Amino acid sequence: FFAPDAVFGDRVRRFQEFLDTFTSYRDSVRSIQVYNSNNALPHRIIISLDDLREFDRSFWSGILVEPAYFIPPAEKALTDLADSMDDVPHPNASAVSSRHPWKLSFKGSFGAHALSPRTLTAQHLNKLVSVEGIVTKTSLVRPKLIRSVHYAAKTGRFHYRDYTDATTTLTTRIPTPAIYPTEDTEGNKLTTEYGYSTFIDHQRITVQEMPEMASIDVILDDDLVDKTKPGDRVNVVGVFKSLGIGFKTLILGNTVYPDFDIRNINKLSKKKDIFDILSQSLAPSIYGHDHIKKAILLMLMGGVEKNLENGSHLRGDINILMVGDPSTAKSQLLRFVLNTASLAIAT
Amino acid sequence: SPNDDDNTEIIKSFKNFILEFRLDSQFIYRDQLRNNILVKNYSLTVNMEHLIGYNEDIYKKLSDEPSDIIPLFETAITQVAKTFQLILNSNANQIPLRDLDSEHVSKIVRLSGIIISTSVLSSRATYLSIMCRNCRHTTSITINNFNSITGNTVSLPDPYIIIHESSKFIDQQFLKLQEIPELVPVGEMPRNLTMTCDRYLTNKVIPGTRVTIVGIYSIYNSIRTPYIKILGIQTEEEEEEFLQLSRNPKLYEILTNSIAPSIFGNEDIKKAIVCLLMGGSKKILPDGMRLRGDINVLLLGDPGTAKSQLLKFVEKVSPIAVYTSGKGSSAAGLTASVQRDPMTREFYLEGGAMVLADGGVVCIDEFDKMRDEDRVAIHEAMEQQTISIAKAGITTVLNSRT
Amino acid sequence: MSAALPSIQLPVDYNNLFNEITDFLVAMLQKVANRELNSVIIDLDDILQYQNEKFLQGTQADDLVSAIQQNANHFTELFCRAIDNNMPLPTKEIDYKDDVLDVILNQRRLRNERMLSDRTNEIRFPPNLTRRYFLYFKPLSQNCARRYRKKAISSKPLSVRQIKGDFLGQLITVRGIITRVSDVKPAVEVIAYTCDQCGYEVFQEVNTPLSECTSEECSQNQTKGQLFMSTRASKFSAFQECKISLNIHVNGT
């Protein structure tokens, strides 16, 4: 195997001390392995950036500048700690569940890293940045081969083969071809076993800048697939890995993030003039038209979705149609509803 | 090697030029370099007219072979602050695009036009590191190809794998500059030219604004297609004549009869052309709204009253004006078009009639015989003065204040 | 080749699991040799009933239900090997007119045996080519799945969107509507190359055509003969493409 250096071996011991000083992160590991074993939840832990910054200021800057040499040491420390926490040895179950790596995620304030797809300059190459936007196109979920398991019918031995790709690890590994070894070193025919082989889903999404503020490709693997829909505001956090002016601007995202006010509501509801006050407050610039403003109030609130027992559902929305002279509190009135409601599409 | 000793005198000359140039007992080049440290903007705007008064041999060597003097300037700026970008600004004569022969190759030229469209951001390799497949020999290669767009013959000594982790990359954007229609002769089509940006020069201009770009005219293999690398994006007697003419109370009657002297009569129609060419005031609300300051005048009547002659007079009088017809202009003519490049397989935008003529008067002929699919794009540009096109996954909004 | 080669001691021993297949098989096997049924549908309900009889006797047997549900691709080669090793003699008399494909295979087997016997006195076939039956695996019914409380996913009709990354190589059930039914195209399996000089048949399994002969007669005489692909000597199987979208490849009867 690869000989660990002095800096790689020191990061493993330092990452294990961070999870031991904070009891909130250690209890989350036992809450997943116990619930998964009793039922038969992903293997990702949302580590806040505010907790790692107060622990060591040297490790907080390394995770945002060069995360290629800080995530493999972080993923190895979590896998070693989870294996020692399971006090229930499984004789006939210690080769299937003990083969998936434990990933990590980040959440919190990023400072100057939360940029935009348009202002995504090349100065933040190979850095952990948080790019936000709206998903426009989503590809199909395709499996990716990572580790294959072979078997020889002449010797009775099992052989493995780890396929390293540019979209697997953050480090620059050797691009091994996707060729299944048919023969072995002794001239024996090998048989590829798909049951014991490890696989991982792969999906590439497109993130575009929001039109209210004014395209990049984000690769989602593991359980991150089938989570982003074309037309949702998400905030994928990952490392800007420039693969390939022939250089693809890809981002290996690790996680996708899609009493005072109550007392003031019940106080104003006691008055018997709340229907005329709230109606005139929708469009203060539009003079008159008190009967038309009262209909938009009941339309935004909506009715009651009556659902029967047999399955025949009933509508509850209120459709309003305005027919009159052009530019008569109609064109400007529709623009106020788009900014008042929480969800509206201008067509 | 005589080139090694000559390169030391060039770098030393640029270091002493910044620490000695002064204007009105004030150091402009020294204060601009110190202020850029706190702002963290690796850039320095150096005027080309300041190098002439300091040393004539320095300005002569820069305009001759700028491909070797500009990279040496970036090394001198970093030594003073201890990579910085050099921004050159020229204030000499504006050379048109049609006067670019073979004598301006590898020379600093000054252009002036309107940006057609803007491509996406592209990464350019500067400090590449290769690794062998057998002995795993890691070596760093410094790419000093300043006059290059793509990877023209990548130096690979090939069992070497380019490492994408420990490699530095800079930003690069492609632009399309068109010549000014005021200098284009009649009966000819205005050509275009592809430019390239680097570092902070990307995402700076707007596709539809007239700016001055000073670059180096060169060629590259794709018969070769020319290109210009962008380096920096930017009388008293005539003023007294315009002030004295505005004081004349009969100015509204002089400019009325002067516009289109062939058509006789129709004082109410000619008076609207003066108010149309002047326009209102583009007021910007602090909430985020923009008011329409342009005036739109629709002509109608029986044919024969010199309808086409009046539209041609406004185009020759207004500085920025594009004449168009009704059925002759479709969706790709009146508005922006989305074309695909058959060489790079990239979807690039193209300006139309209402896009290239931003800030002027668009004369349309035969507005009654137009189609229905082309009437929707006109109504959107007459109210919000913007063109929203969301096709082929490209959602770009272009200003159309015509 | 000595940095990342682990030896995962899997609990599924293939040496001891092959003995249980021979004991389970020992009516449907006699119809295959009589050229009457070319589809050996191995129902999973019979394996579940066989495990209940062995568990009451006190024999520690492996979980055959969970082994097939985890990797059924390797069971197709292990189940077919026990059938050929325990194939009984055909009761009906084999004639020289029925099935002309078997007459050529019987004549080539006797010709190859005479050449090997004559070569031994002077000094002193792939398994897929002889397998004429298509083994199938029938899923468990809804009645037998209620009594078995050990991963009852193979008996539930799953959908297309429910297929995740852990169902690769597993015997699952897909329910939908078959769309775009293609034609029946014969797919080859073992390609035999008949030489022109020595005249040897070089068999090659299909999971690039061979041009140079690999026989010992063409290598000792320094005369590499051109290998000619024989269509009559190659075994072809049925192949049909169907879309349920998910592509479904139907092979056999």
Side-chain angles (χ1 to χ4, degrees), chain A residues 1-98 100-124 126-136 138-159 161-195 197-247 249-270 272-280 282-286 288-305 307-308 310-316 318 320-347, chain B residues 1-66 68-146 148-164 166-170 172-190 192-209 211-223 225-308 310-311 314-334 336-368 370-402, chain C residues 1-9 11-99 101-235 237-253:
Chain A
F1 51 89
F2 266 61
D5 212 355
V7 201
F8 185 80
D10 189 62
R11 285 162 196 208
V12 180
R13 191 178 179 130
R14 281 241 186 81
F15 263 124
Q16 286 172 326
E17 198 170 18
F18 164 72
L19 293 166
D20 273 330
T21 49
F22 286 103
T23 61
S24 50
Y25 291 116
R26 189 169 183 154
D27 288 323
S28 84
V29 188
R30 203 190 199 171
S31 72
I32 297 168
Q33 293 177 283
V34 166
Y35 178 73
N36 283 358
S37 62
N38 288 334
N39 195 21
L41 288 178
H43 288 187
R44 295 192 295 114
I45 299 186
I46 308 163
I47 289 185
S48 171
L49 276 179
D50 295 287
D51 291 332
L52 199 135
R53 179 195 67 189
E54 285 176 25
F55 179 76
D56 206 342
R57 292 289 172 141
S58 76
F59 272 72
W60 180 79
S61 50
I63 208 69
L64 295 171
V65 169
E66 201 177 45
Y69 302 124
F70 271 106
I71 298 286
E75 291 182 324
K76 293 179 179 179
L78 181 61
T79 317
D80 185 76
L81 198 133
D83 291 330
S84 81
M85 204 71 188
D86 277 331
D87 299 317
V88 190
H90 284 286
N92 294 342
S94 53
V96 188
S97 313
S98 53
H100 287 264
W102 273 74
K103 280 180 173 172
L104 280 177
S105 37
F106 306 96
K107 185 198 168 204
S109 192
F110 293 91
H113 288 83
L115 302 166
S116 90
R118 176 195 295 265
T119 64
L120 192 63
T121 72
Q123 299 187 6
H124 313 269
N126 312 313
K127 296 192 182 157
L128 190 73
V129 290
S130 51
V131 190
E132 60 172 15
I134 305 174
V135 188
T136 45
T138 47
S139 184
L140 298 174
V141 185
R142 294 180 172 184
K144 177 179 169 188
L145 177 70
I146 164 73
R147 174 178 59 209
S148 63
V149 177
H150 304 274
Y151 174 66
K154 286 177 168 187
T155 61
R157 297 185 71 155
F158 290 99
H159 295 246
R161 181 57 58 140
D162 308 311
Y163 293 87
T164 50
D165 208 55
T167 67
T168 309
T169 54
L170 302 180
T171 174
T172 310
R173 286 299 196 189
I174 288 99
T176 53
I179 299 173
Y180 288 108
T182 51
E183 298 190 340
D184 213 31
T185 56
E186 295 184 5
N188 301 321
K189 294 198 172 195
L190 294 174
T191 48
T192 312
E193 289 190 0
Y194 302 105
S197 300
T198 319
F199 291 91
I200 173 172
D201 279 317
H202 174 270
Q203 194 180 32
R204 200 189 302 156
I205 67 170
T206 66
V207 181
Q208 207 167 44
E209 192 173 54
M210 307 198 198
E212 297 140 1
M213 199 70 81
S215 306
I216 54 164
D217 286 14
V218 178
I219 290 175
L220 302 181
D221 290 344
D222 210 4
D223 72 312
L224 282 176
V225 308
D226 217 49
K227 274 190 169 160
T228 61
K229 304 211 204 129
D232 285 326
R233 283 169 206 243
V234 299
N235 196 1
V236 185
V237 184
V239 189
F240 184 49
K241 198 76 188 75
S242 50
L243 297 186
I245 51 96
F247 292 109
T249 59
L250 290 149
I251 289 184
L252 297 176
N254 297 14
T255 167
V256 184
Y257 299 115
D259 191 69
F260 186 75
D261 275 319
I262 310 173
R263 197 184 304 175
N264 281 330
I265 285 167
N266 288 311
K267 180 186 168 192
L268 202 66
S269 69
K270 291 172 185 173
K272 295 187 177 185
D273 210 51
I274 208 174
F275 187 54
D276 202 59
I277 288 165
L278 281 168
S279 77
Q280 290 166 8
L282 175 65
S285 53
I286 299 177
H289 304 281
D290 296 333
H291 286 239
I292 318 183
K293 290 178 185 176
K294 280 166 184 164
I296 317 157
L297 204 140
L298 303 176
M299 174 192 79
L300 286 172
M301 297 265 277
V304 173
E305 188 180 5
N307 291 350
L308 302 180
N310 60 341
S312 181
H313 73 303
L314 294 173
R315 76 182 200 177
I318 297 160
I320 310 178
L321 181 63
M322 298 178 293
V323 171
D325 309 307
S327 311
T328 47
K330 284 198 290 151
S331 306
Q332 199 68 32
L333 181 128
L334 288 183
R335 293 177 191 115
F336 287 125
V337 197
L338 297 152
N339 294 349
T340 309
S342 51
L343 179 54
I345 297 186
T347 51
Chain B
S1 42
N3 291 354
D4 282 339
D5 285 334
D6 284 357
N7 282 333
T8 64
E9 294 192 355
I10 294 167
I11 298 167
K12 281 169 187 164
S13 302
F14 287 139
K15 176 177 178 185
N16 293 352
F17 163 69
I18 313 164
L19 293 174
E20 288 180 356
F21 189 79
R22 56 183 180 175
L23 281 178
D24 302 324
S25 311
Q26 286 188 2
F27 290 98
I28 300 180
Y29 283 132
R30 188 178 168 176
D31 287 336
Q32 191 175 10
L33 191 144
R34 185 186 178 187
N35 287 341
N36 279 355
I37 297 175
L38 295 169
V39 188
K40 304 179 178 177
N41 192 6
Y42 306 107
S43 60
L44 184 65
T45 66
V46 179
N47 290 346
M48 287 192 76
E49 291 184 321
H50 292 176
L51 285 161
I52 307 171
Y54 191 79
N55 204 336
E56 201 174 351
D57 294 322
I58 292 181
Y59 177 74
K60 189 178 181 181
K61 286 185 179 188
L62 180 65
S63 60
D64 283 341
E65 296 181 347
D68 290 2
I69 313 297
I70 289 170
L72 291 174
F73 221 138
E74 296 193 351
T75 63
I77 301 167
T78 320
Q79 285 177 8
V80 175
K82 276 176 177 190
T83 51
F84 279 80
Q85 193 175 20
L86 176 70
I87 297 176
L88 294 182
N89 285 344
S90 186
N91 291 333
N93 292 343
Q94 298 176 13
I95 304 172
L97 194 72
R98 291 176 176 276
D99 290 359
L100 284 179
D101 292 325
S102 52
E103 298 190 356
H104 300 105
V105 182
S106 304
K107 286 182 181 160
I108 300 179
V109 292
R110 186 189 189 190
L111 295 192
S112 196
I114 310 171
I115 300 296
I116 301 168
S117 71
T118 299
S119 81
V120 293
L121 293 172
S122 63
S123 305
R124 174 179 166 171
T126 56
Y127 291 85
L128 281 190
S129 182
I130 51 177
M131 179 197 281
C132 178
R133 286 172 183 192
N134 296 65
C135 59
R136 292 182 181 172
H137 194 56
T138 52
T139 40
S140 54
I141 302 178
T142 62
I143 302 176
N144 274 9
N145 285 7
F146 197 82
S148 181
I149 296 173
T150 57
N152 292 357
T153 73
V154 180
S155 57
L156 284 175
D158 313 327
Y160 277 107
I161 295 175
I162 299 166
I163 298 170
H164 293 284
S166 49
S167 295
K168 302 181 179 178
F169 305 96
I170 62 170
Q172 181 169 9
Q173 203 165 43
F174 307 96
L175 287 185
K176 280 202 181 182
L177 182 83
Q178 202 163 25
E179 54 187 5
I180 300 175
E182 295 171 31
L183 296 168
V184 181
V186 283
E188 290 204 19
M189 179 183 163
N192 41 14
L193 195 68
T194 308
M195 325 188 91
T196 45
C197 300
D198 270 321
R199 297 179 187 170
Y200 296 96
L201 290 174
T202 73
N203 289 339
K204 200 183 179 191
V205 298
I206 302 173
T209 316
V211 288
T212 301
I213 301 171
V214 189
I216 309 162
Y217 185 61
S218 195
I219 49 183
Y220 77 105
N221 205 11
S222 190
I223 304 175
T225 55
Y227 82 106
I228 285 190
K229 182 169 184 173
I230 297 189
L231 304 175
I233 310 174
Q234 294 177 345
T235 57
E236 198 170 0
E237 299 182 346
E238 278 182 31
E239 183 160 332
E240 198 181 352
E241 283 190 10
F242 295 147
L243 192 71
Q244 287 179 15
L245 195 76
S246 74
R247 291 171 182 177
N248 206 350
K250 293 187 176 184
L251 187 55
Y252 197 49
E253 294 177 349
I254 288 168
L255 276 166
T256 300
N257 294 340
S258 302
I259 292 178
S262 68
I263 309 174
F264 190 80
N266 294 337
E267 292 188 4
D268 292 317
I269 310 178
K270 290 184 182 197
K271 270 177 182 181
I273 311 165
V274 186
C275 298
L276 171 127
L277 286 174
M278 288 300 181
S281 186
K282 292 179 181 177
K283 307 167 184 167
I284 303 173
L285 280 98
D287 302 340
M289 295 183 74
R290 298 180 181 174
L291 289 172
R292 166 172 156 213
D294 305 322
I295 304 175
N296 291 343
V297 178
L298 179 64
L299 304 181
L300 202 134
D302 301 359
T305 54
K307 290 196 199 159
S308 309
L310 193 132
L311 290 181
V314 185
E315 184 193 15
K316 288 181 182 187
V317 161
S318 191
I320 302 178
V322 172
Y323 181 77
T324 177
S325 173
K327 282 181 172 162
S329 313
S330 64
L334 285 167
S337 190
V338 183
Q339 293 207 15
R340 191 182 186 186
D341 209 313
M343 295 201 74
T344 62
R345 293 183 175 184
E346 295 181 341
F347 295 103
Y348 65 99
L349 212 69
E350 190 165 3
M354 303 189 69
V355 185
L356 300 175
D358 184 49
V361 179
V362 176
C363 293
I364 318 181
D365 205 358
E366 303 197 329
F367 209 70
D368 61 305
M370 282 195 48
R371 303 178 182 189
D372 287 319
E373 295 176 5
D374 290 328
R375 199 179 277 185
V376 191
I378 299 190
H379 293 340
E380 196 183 334
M382 283 177 73
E383 193 86 6
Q384 299 180 346
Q385 309 194 295
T386 41
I387 299 171
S388 67
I389 294 175
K391 292 181 182 174
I394 304 178
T395 57
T396 50
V397 179
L398 296 179
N399 300 323
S400 63
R401 313 161 298 169
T402 64
Chain C
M1 291 190 273
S2 206
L5 263 170
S7 53
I8 298 172
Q9 291 171 342
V12 189
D13 196 7
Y14 290 111
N15 274 332
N16 293 334
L17 204 70
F18 184 74
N19 295 334
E20 203 180 354
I21 306 163
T22 58
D23 195 24
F24 167 68
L25 290 170
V26 176
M28 287 184 183
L29 287 177
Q30 287 273 4
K31 289 184 177 186
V32 184
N34 292 343
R35 308 171 179 177
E36 294 178 357
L37 187 71
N38 298 339
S39 59
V40 187
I41 306 174
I42 301 299
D43 308 332
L44 283 187
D45 287 328
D46 293 349
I47 312 184
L48 190 130
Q49 286 176 17
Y50 182 75
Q51 273 191 314
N52 294 325
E53 291 171 9
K54 266 192 158 169
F55 194 81
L56 291 164
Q57 292 176 9
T59 302
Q60 187 74 26
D62 281 327
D63 201 358
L64 284 170
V65 182
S66 79
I68 303 165
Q69 282 173 14
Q70 279 302 296
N71 194 8
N73 193 41
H74 202 292
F75 268 90
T76 60
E77 295 173 8
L78 286 179
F79 259 78
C80 284
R81 192 180 181 182
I83 293 169
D84 296 328
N85 286 356
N86 286 341
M87 192 162 290
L89 289 153
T91 305
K92 198 175 179 181
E93 296 184 3
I94 288 179
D95 279 331
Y96 290 95
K97 291 187 178 179
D98 292 348
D99 196 29
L101 189 60
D102 265 330
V103 188
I104 305 172
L105 259 68
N106 197 14
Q107 279 179 2
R108 276 177 182 145
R109 186 179 177 171
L110 197 64
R111 184 184 176 197
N112 201 22
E113 192 174 357
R114 280 175 188 157
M115 287 288 294
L116 289 174
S117 72
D118 288 339
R119 272 180 163 209
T120 314
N121 288 332
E122 275 185 335
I123 301 168
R124 194 184 196 160
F125 291 116
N128 290 325
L129 201 133
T130 56
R131 281 164 187 178
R132 285 167 150 276
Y133 57 94
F134 295 100
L135 195 131
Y136 299 127
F137 278 116
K138 187 193 188 180
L140 301 105
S141 184
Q142 292 179 357
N143 290 346
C144 297
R146 194 176 174 187
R147 301 178 181 181
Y148 207 67
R149 216 179 185 165
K150 276 181 175 181
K151 289 182 179 177
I153 322 168
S154 61
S155 64
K156 283 176 188 183
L158 298 176
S159 72
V160 191
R161 207 169 299 213
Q162 285 169 343
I163 304 174
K164 289 181 183 184
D166 56 338
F167 293 123
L168 267 83
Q170 301 193 8
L171 191 76
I172 63 172
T173 41
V174 184
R175 178 174 59 180
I177 301 163
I178 305 149
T179 52
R180 305 173 189 184
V181 177
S182 174
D183 282 320
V184 182
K185 300 173 186 169
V188 86
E189 290 181 350
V190 180
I191 303 173
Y193 304 98
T194 51
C195 186
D196 198 37
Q197 291 183 350
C198 67
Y200 266 95
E201 297 191 359
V202 179
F203 304 102
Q204 183 186 16
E205 299 196 331
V206 181
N207 294 340
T208 303
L210 295 168
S211 54
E212 301 188 354
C213 193
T214 52
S215 67
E216 47 162 30
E217 287 192 349
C218 282
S219 192
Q220 288 177 17
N221 289 325
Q222 294 186 355
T223 40
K224 295 188 179 190
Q226 179 64 38
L227 285 181
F228 293 103
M229 177 183 72
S230 182
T231 49
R232 290 186 291 183
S234 54
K235 182 189 175 205
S237 59
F239 175 74
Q240 192 174 31
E241 294 185 345
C242 294
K243 299 189 176 183
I244 197 167
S245 59
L246 182 72
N247 293 338
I248 294 176
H249 295 166
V250 192
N251 289 337
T253 311

